[PDB]
Amino acid sequence: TGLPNRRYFFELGNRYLDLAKREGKKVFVLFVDLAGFKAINDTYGHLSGDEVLKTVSKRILDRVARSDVVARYGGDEFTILLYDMKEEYLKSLLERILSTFREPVRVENKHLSVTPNIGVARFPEDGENLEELLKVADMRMYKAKEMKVPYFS
Amino acid sequence: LTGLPNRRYFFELGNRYLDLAKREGKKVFVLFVDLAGFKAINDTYGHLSGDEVLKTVSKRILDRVARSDVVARYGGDEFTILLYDMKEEYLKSLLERILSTFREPVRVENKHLSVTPNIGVARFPEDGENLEELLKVADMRMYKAKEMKVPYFS
Amino acid sequence: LTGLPNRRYFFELGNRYLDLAKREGKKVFVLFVDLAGFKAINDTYGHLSGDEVLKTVSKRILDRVARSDVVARYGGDEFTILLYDMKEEYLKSLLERILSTFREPVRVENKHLSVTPNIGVARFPEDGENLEELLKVADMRMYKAKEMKVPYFS
Amino acid sequence: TGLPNRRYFFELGNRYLDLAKREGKKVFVLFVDLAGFKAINDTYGHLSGDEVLKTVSKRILDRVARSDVVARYGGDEFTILLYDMKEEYLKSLLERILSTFREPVRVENKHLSVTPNIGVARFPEDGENLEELLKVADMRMYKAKEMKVPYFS
Amino acid sequence: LTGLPNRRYFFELGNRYLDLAKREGKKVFVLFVDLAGFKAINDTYGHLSGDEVLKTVSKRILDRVARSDVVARYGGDEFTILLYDMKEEYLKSLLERILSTFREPVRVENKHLSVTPNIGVARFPEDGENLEELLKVADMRMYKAKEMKVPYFS
Amino acid sequence: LTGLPNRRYFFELGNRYLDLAKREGKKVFVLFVDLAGFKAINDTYGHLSGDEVLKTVSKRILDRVARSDVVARYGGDEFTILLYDMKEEYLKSLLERILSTFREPVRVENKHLSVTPNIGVARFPEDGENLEELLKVADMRMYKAKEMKVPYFS
C-alpha cells in the first residue's frame, strides 16, 4: 500500500496535537472501518484482500489534502488526521470517501464489496492525546456500524 | 447500452416535473454533466472502449441519485440529472459524491481510462420556466466551470 | 394521429410519479377509461372512422385534465389517466366532466358515432405500490362498473 | 408487405398536394377497403391474414404507376395517391384493381376471399389536405360498401 | 377439364349470334385472346402443368364475362370471346379486367408460371359478315398487338 | 429537436419527386449544404450548444424554402434541399438568401457561434437518374466549393 502503520501515525499524530495546542486549532481524527473485509480474505485469500487494501489506500490518499495524515490501523481499519480544517471540509471529505466505496473493488475477475463506517473525534473536545481521540472515534464508528448509517460525528 | 434514457424521454419527464413543481410550489435542480476526456477516448481506443466507459459512468450516476431523480444521457460527453424538491445540502453532497466517482480512472479491459467531470446547475423557477431554458443555463454554467478549471458552477 | 403517448411512456412516467408520491407522502389516482362501442365502430366503419373517434376522444380527455396530469392510450378501447396529489373533490368533478363529454355521439364525416365510457379508479398507496398493480385494480373496478351498467367505480 | 404506413403516407401525401397547388394539377385519393378480412384472421389466424395482406399489397403495387403512392392505412385498409392523372387512367386503374380481388387468394391449402370497396376523392374539389380527402374517400367507400357496388367517385 | 367449349361449338353459336345481330340491327365484338408464354410452359413443365394453367385461364375469363357472352378455347395459346350488343365502354373495361388477371403469374403446384395476354378485336358488321372473317381480322389485330409489344388492338 | 426529417425520409420523398419529374418532363435541383465550423463547435462547447445551432440552422433553411421544397438533415455538418421544377433564377436567389443567413454568427446562450456555408448543386436529369447519384455530384461540387474557398458551385 505504501501507507504508514500505527506507530508512525502515533508519532505524527501527537506532534499535530502539540502543534494544535500551541496554535489554538482543532484536529479531526477519523476512524475508518471497512466492513466485508474479514469475509474477503476468508474466501479469496490474502492476495485478493491485499489488492483491495492497495485500492482502498490509493482511494483515501487521492481524496485527502497534502497535509492530511492517512495511515492503516489494522485489518478493516484506517485512520485519517485533519489539522485545522473547516467542518464543511470534513462533511465533504466524508461524502467523497463514502462515495468511493459504493464502487465494488475490481481485483482480478472478481468484484469485491466493502462497506465504509467512519467515526469522528475532535481535538480538544474529545481528548488531549491520539489514544483518547481514536477510542472516541472508534466508539462513534461502532455506533455508526450498529446503527447501519455511514458516519457518526 | 447503459439502459439510460435519451434526450426525448428526459424532455417529456422533465417538463412534467416542472409542471408538478409549478403547482406544488417546489424547486427543481437541473444538472448538466460533461465528462471531458471522452472525445479523446473514442479517437484513440474506439467505440467499444468509449461505450464501456459510458456504461460505467451511467451506473456510477444511477447508484448515487435518489429513486425519484431523473438521470439521462444528453449526447456525447453529456448527462443530465433532474432533482425534484431537494434541499441545497442534498445537491452539494450529490455533486461531491458524483465528482468523487470520476476521480477513479475507469477500467475498461487492460486499460485505465480517465474522464474529468464538469457540472453546471440551474434552479427552477429562478433560472427558467421550461427544461430547454434550464439546460441552457446549466450548460453555460458547466462551460464557465470547464474554462475556469473548477469542478462545478451553481 | 392523437399525439397521445403509449403504454411504455405511461409506465415510465407513472412509476416516477409513484416514486415521488412515496417520498412526499402524497396520493396518486389511476383512472382506467374504457370506451365501449369502439369494437363495433371499426368492424362497421373501418379504421379511419375508428381512428378519427380516437383523435376526438384524446382531445376531449386532454382538454379536461390539469397540465400535470398524465394521459395515455393503453390499447384498443383503453385510456389511462394519472392524477398526482389531487383532492377527491377534483376526481369526482373530473370523472363527471369526462363522462359528460362522451354523452355526445362523436361526429366523424356524415356519421354520428356513439361510445359509452366506463371508468375504474385506484389510489396509491392503498391499492398498490407500482403502476401494474394499480392498473389491474382500476381495470377490475372499470369491469365491475361495465357489468353493473354504471359509469364509474372508485 | 414492404408497404409504407399511415405516417409515411401523410408526409408524402401533403407534399404531393403542396406540389399540385403550385402546378395547378389534380390529385386522386383512393380509399381501398377489403371486406372479408376481419373474418379471415378470426378463423385462420394472423399468419394467414398476413399472407393475404402480402398478396393484396403486391397486387396493388404491380398495377399502379411508379409515381403513385400506395400505403396500408390499417386493418382492411389501403390508400392510393395519383398525382396529375387523367380520369380515364383512374377508371382503368379501379377496374384492374377490382379484377385482381375477384381471384380468391391462395394461402397454403386455403382459397381465401376478399371483396374490394373503393372510395375516390379529388384534390382540390374535395379538400385542401390529406386528412380531409381521406375522410371524403372513406365516406364514399362506405357509400359503395352499403350500396353493394364496387366503387364510388 | 376446363368445361370450356371448342372451335366447332363457338362457330355454331357464333354465326347464330351474327344472324340475330343482322336482324336486330346490333353490333357484335369478337375478341381473339392469345396467351404468350404457353408454348414454353408445356416444353419445360409438361402437359399437366400447361393444362392446369389452361384451367385457371378459362375460369379467369369465365368469371369476368357476362352470362350472355360466349367464351371458347380456339386452339393453342388461343381463346375467343363473343360480345353481343355491348357498349364500347363495356369492351374497354372487359379488356382491362382480363389483362389485369394475367399480370398475376399462375400458381400450378410449387411453380409460379407466367403468361402474357395479347387481344385482338373485330366488330360485326364493319369487319365482316361471318365468324371466320371476324376471327381473321381479330387474329391479325392481336398479331399487330403481339409484334407492337402492346396488350390490345381494336 | 429540429423537427427536420432524416436521410431515410429524404430518400423516399426524393426518389418519388424524381419519378414525378421523369413523367412530367421537369428538372429537380438537389442542394448539398455543408456547414463548416460545426465539428469545432461540438468539440469545444458540447452537444447541447451544437444542437441549438442545428435547431437555428434548420429553422433558417425552413423559413427560406418554398412549401413544396424538401429539406432534411443528412448527417453532421450536412443538410439536403430538393427543388422540384424551379427556375434557375429561383435557385440563384435561394442560394443567396441561405448564404446570407450564415453570415450572422448564431447566438446560443451567451455565445456567438460561427458556421460557414458550402453548397453544391446537382440537376436532374443531367447529373443523374436517382437521388444517390445526384447527392454524390452535389457533394463533389460542395467539396470543390469548400476547397476553392467560394460559397457555392453549380
Residue numbers in the entry:
A (entry chain Z), D (entry chain V): 94 to 246
B (entry chain U), C (entry chain Y), E (entry chain W), F (entry chain X): 93 to 246
What did the study's authors say about this model?
We report the structure of tDGC from Thermotoga maritima, an important enzyme for the large scale enzymatic synthesis of c-di-GMP and the first GGDEF domain from a hyperthermophile. We expressed and crystallized a domain of the TM1788 protein from Thermotoga maritima (248 residues, WP_010865403) spanning residues 82–248, hereafter named tDGC. Cellular levels of c-di-GMP are tightly regulated by the opposing activities of diguanylate cyclases (DGCs) that synthesize c-di-GMP from two GTP molecules and phosphodiesterases (PDEs) that hydrolyze c-di-GMP into 5′-phosphoguanylyl- (3′-5′) - guanosine (pGpG) and GMP. C-di-GMP synthesis from two separate GTP molecules requires dimerization of two active GGDEF domains, with the loops bearing the GGDEF motifs of each monomer brought in close proximity to initiate the cyclization reaction.
Enzyme assays showed that tDGC is active even after days of incubation at 30°C but with very low product production, irrespective of substrate concentration, due to feedback inhibition. However, a mutation (R158A) at the I-site of tDGC significantly alleviates production inhibition, enabling synthesis of several hundred milligrams of c-di-GMP with just 10 mg of the mutant enzyme. We also report the structure of the R158A mutant of tDGC. The R158A mutation in the I-site abolishes feedback inhibition by preventing formation of the inactive c-di-GMP-locked dimer.
